[PDB]
């Protein structure tokens, strides 16, 4: 939520992301939020994943966040398990 | 030239009925007496076009954009190659 954008930095970040993630079994670790370059890492993820030979998910992007800092916590709590886990953005 | 006149010919010769001349009376009773009640024949036009939905439209268009980026970077790679860029370099 405190970020700014310029073109060639975005290009460098995206190119590095796909080149490092598409080869080998690289695991990219990042938080949980859709803000700034933090959102742009994911948008690059789907920019690569939309056109993929194996299709489905060729990348394992793990998000880390604090339960305290979650907007729609109501509905994310279950006693044992239901697993629709709906989270509208 | 072969393929071009083939497609030009088929574009208007493809809209011909599948009923053989021996069995043309059925198509006659279906369409030629149907003509007179209308000023202009409004039969369904025989083409290979398809109606596109919004979701498939966007899902495709993003994909052509991504492969266009892939083509543009490759294009730059070839514009490095010819010796003209070498001589002005």
The stretches of A23-72 forming alpha helices (DSSP H) are 37-49
Q: At what angle do helices A7-22 and A37-49 cross, to 10 degrees?
A: 50
Among A residues 4-43, those touching chain B with beta carbons less than 8 Å apart: none
Q: Is A19 within 8 Å of A11 (Cβ atoms)?
A: no
Q: Is A74 within 8 Å of A48 (Cβ atoms)?
A: no
Give the residue from A76, A49, A73 showing the smallest Cα distance to A61. A49
**For residue B70, which phi and psi values (nearest 5 degrees)?**
-65, -35
* Chain A closest-CA separation from residue B74 CA (Å): 14
Owner of token pair 């790679």: B77
A51–chain B Cβ distance below 8 A for any pair: yes
Mutate to test the interface with B, among A22, A43, A48, A50 (most CBs of B within 10 A): A50
B72–chain A Cβ distance below 8 A for any pair: no
Which two three-digit tokens encode residue A39? 């959102």
Distances (CA, A) of B35 to A48, B29, B46: 54, 10, 17
B59–chain A Cβ distance below 8 A for any pair: yes
Q: For residues B60 and A33, what is the distance between their CA atoms, to the nearest angstrom?
A: 27
> How was this model experimentally determined?
cryo-EM
The stretches of chain A forming alpha helices (DSSP H) are 7-22, 37-49
Q: Based on the number of CB atoms within 10 Å of its own CB, is A28 exposed (0-12), middle (13-18) or buried (19 or more)?
A: middle
B52–chain A Cβ distance below 8 A for any pair: no
């Amino acid at each position: 939520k405190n970020f700014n954008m310029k073109p060639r930095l975005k290009s460098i970040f995206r190119r590095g992301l796909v080149k490092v993630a598409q080869t080998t079994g690289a695991w990219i670790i990042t938080g949980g939020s859709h803000t700034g370059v933090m959102k742009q890492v994911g948008e690059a993820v789907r920019d690569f994943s939309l056109s993929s030979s194996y299709k489905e998910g060729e990348l394992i992007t793990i998000g880390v966040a604090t339960w305290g800092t979650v907007h729609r916590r109501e509905g994310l709590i279950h006693p044992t398990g239901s697993f629709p886990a709906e989270y509208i953005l | 030239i072969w393929k071009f006149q083939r497609h030009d010919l088929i574009e208007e010769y493809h809209g011909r009925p599948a009923a053989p001349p021996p069995f043309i009376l059925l198509s006659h009773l279906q369409l030629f007496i149907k003509r007179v009640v209308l000023k202009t024949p409004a039969k369904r036009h025989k083409q290979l076009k398809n109606k596109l939905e919004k979701n498939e439209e966007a899902a495709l268009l993003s994909w052509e954009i991504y492969l266009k980026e892939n083509y543009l970077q490759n294009r730059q790679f070839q514009q490095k190659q010819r010796p003209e860029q070498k001589i002005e370099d």
